[PDB]
Amino acid sequence: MHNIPVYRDITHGNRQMTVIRKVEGDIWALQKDVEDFLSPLLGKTPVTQVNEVTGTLRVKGYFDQQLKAWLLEKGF
Amino acid sequence: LRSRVTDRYWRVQEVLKHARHFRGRKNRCYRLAVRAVTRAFVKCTRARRLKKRSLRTLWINRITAASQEHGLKYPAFIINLIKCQVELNRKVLADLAIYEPKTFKSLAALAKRRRXXXXXXXX
Amino acid sequence: XXXXXXXXXXXXXXXXXXXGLTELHPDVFSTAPRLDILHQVAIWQKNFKRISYAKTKTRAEVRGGGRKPWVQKGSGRARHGSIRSPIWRGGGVAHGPRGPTSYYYMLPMKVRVQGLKVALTVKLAQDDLHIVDSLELPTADPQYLIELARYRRWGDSVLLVDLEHEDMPQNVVAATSGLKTFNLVPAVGLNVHSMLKHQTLVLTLPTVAFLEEKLXXXXXXXXX
C-alpha cells in the first residue's frame, strides 16, 4: 500500500490549500507538533483542525514535502 | 397533494379578529380589513411618535400660562431656569404649575431676581 | 494494532442460562460511526423503493376541446382560450407529477458497504449485539419465545440472523408465525435496513463468520 493519505484541496480555480487526514493516534498532539514545527519555518502557526467523525488538518502554506517526510520517518 | 385546509380561514379569522370595532365591510370583509389594519399600524407608529410632541406643546402652553400669571413670559422663565441650573422637565414643571402654585411662585421669584440682578449688573 | 475483544455468550436458550464463553475478534469495528453515510444509505433505501405512479393531465391531455368559447373582443368578457387551460376549473396543472420519472440513483459500493459496516459497529458498541454458537427451539411456541424474551430481558425489538435458509424447520416455523417483536432473515440476506429497523441484534457463529468474511473482503477490496 501507499504511506498516508495526502489531500490537495482546491477552493477555487487559481487558489490552493493543503489538507491532511487522521491516520494513527489522536489528532490534537500531532496538531500541536505541526504547530511547533511550522512556527519557526513559516513564522506563524495557522493550523486548524476540523473534526466530524474523523478529522482534517488545514494549514496556510505548502509544507507537503515536509509533511510526507515527517509521516514517513515517524511511521504513523 | 396538499390542501387549502384551515390555514387561510384562520389567517382571515385572525385579521378579522384584529378588525373588530371597525366600521362597515372593514370589520367584515378580509381585504378591506387588511387595508385598514396597515393604515391603523402606520397611524399607531406616527401618533406614538407625535404624542411626545403634543404633550410637550401642551406642557409648554400650561407653563406659559402659569408664568404669564406672574408677569413674565415662557422664554424668560426658561432662560432663568437654565441659568439657575434647573434641569427639571416641563412635565413636572407643569404639574407644579397646576397643583403647587407655591413652588412655581418661588421659581418665578428667583427668576425675576436673577433677571433684575443681571439687568443691574449689566448697567 | 488495536485488537478489539468481544465476548460471545453461548445460550442454550432452554431457560435460566446466561453462561457461555467464546472469544471473538470483530476487526470490522470502526472508531467513529458515520451519521452522514448511514443517513444517505437510509434515504437511498427509501428512494429506490418508490413506485413513482403519481399521474395527472396537462391541458394537452385533457379530454376537452380546443375551441374558443367566444370572440376575443366585443364580448365584454375576459380574453380566454380553450377551457382546458389551468386557469379554468375544468383544466389540469402544468407543473404536476403527470410526467413520470425514477427517484432512484446509483450509490458507490464503498459508500453502502461502509454504511452496513458502520451500522454494524453502532449496534456492536451499543451492547445490543450478542453472539451465540447456535439456536434451539424444541417446543416451538409463541409463549415460549415471549417468556424467553421477558426472562432473559432482551430488547423490545430483536432481529435474529442465524440460518442459511436451507435447514432447521423447527425454529423458522415458530419464529415466522405471528411474531411482531422478533424478525427472521438468512445470514446471506442480512442488510443495514433490517438492522436499523430493530433496536437489538442477535447473531450466531456461522452468521458472524460469513459476515466478517464478506466485510473483511470488502474492506480489503476498498483499501486496495
Binding site: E52 | - | S30, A32, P33, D36, L38, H39, V122, Q126
Partner: protein, 169 residues
C-alpha cells in the same frame, strides 16, 4: 478516542428519528414565494428576460457572432483520423517494480499491465499504439523486459543501459 467517548455515555440507541445530516450537507432549496423578491421571481421588470421566449445562447444580439469572424484551421480535422499513441513514463514502470508486482520476464506483457490498473483504457481510440516517454529513469531497477509497439530513443537507451530488454513489435 471518539469510540470510548461514544461507548461511555448511554445514548438513545440512535433511532431512525435521531438521524441527522452534517452541517451544510443538503441545501435549503430557495422558494420564490415571499416578500423577499417581489412578484418578479428574480427575473426583473419586463424585458425578454421575464418571458420564457428569451433569445437562444450563442447570440450576440444581431451583430456578427464571435465564431463567424474566426478563420478556419485543421485542428478538428486531426481528432478524427489521427493515429493514437499513448506515452508512458519509466517512473511509472519502476514504480510498478517497487510495488511488488510481477518480476519475471516471461509473464510480463500489456495484459498484465492492464490487470495492475496501470494502463489507460482506449475505447474510442482506433489503431492504438504504445509508446514510452522517458522520465524518472535515474537509477531505476534492473533486469526487466518490456514489449511495446514503438519505443522512443531515450526509452530504449534507459532500458538497455541497466540491462533491460526492449521488444519492438
Amino acid at each position: 478516542x471518539x469510540x470510548x467517548x461514544x461507548x461511555x455515555x448511554x445514548x438513545x440507541x440512535v433511532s431512525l428519528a435521531n438521524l441527522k445530516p452534517n452541517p451544510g450537507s443538503r441545501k435549503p432549496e430557495r422558494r420564490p414565494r415571499g416578500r423577499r423578491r417581489g412578484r418578479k421571481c428574480g427575473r426583473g421588470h419586463k424585458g425578454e428576460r421575464q418571458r420564457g421566449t428569451r433569445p437562444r445562447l450563442g447570440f450576440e444580439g444581431g451583430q456578427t457572432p464571435f465564431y463567424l469572424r474566426i478563420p478556419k484551421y485543421g485542428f478538428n480535422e486531426g481528432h478524427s483520423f489521427r493515429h493514437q499513441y499513448q506515452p508512458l513514463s519509466l517512473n511509472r514502470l519502476q514504480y510498478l517494480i517497487d510495488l511488488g508486482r510481477v518480476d519475471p520476464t516471461q509473464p510480463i506483457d500489456l495484459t498484465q499491465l492492464v490487470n495492475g490498473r496501470g494502463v489507460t483504457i482506449q475505447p474510442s481510440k482506433r489503431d492504438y499504439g504504445v509508446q514510452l516517454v522517458e522520465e524518472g529513469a535515474d537509477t531505476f531497477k534492473a533486469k526487466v523486459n518490456i514489449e511495446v509497439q514503438m519505443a522512443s530513443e531515450l526509452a530504449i537507451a534507459a532500458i538497455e543501459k541497466n540491462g533491460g530488454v526492449v521488444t519492438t513489435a
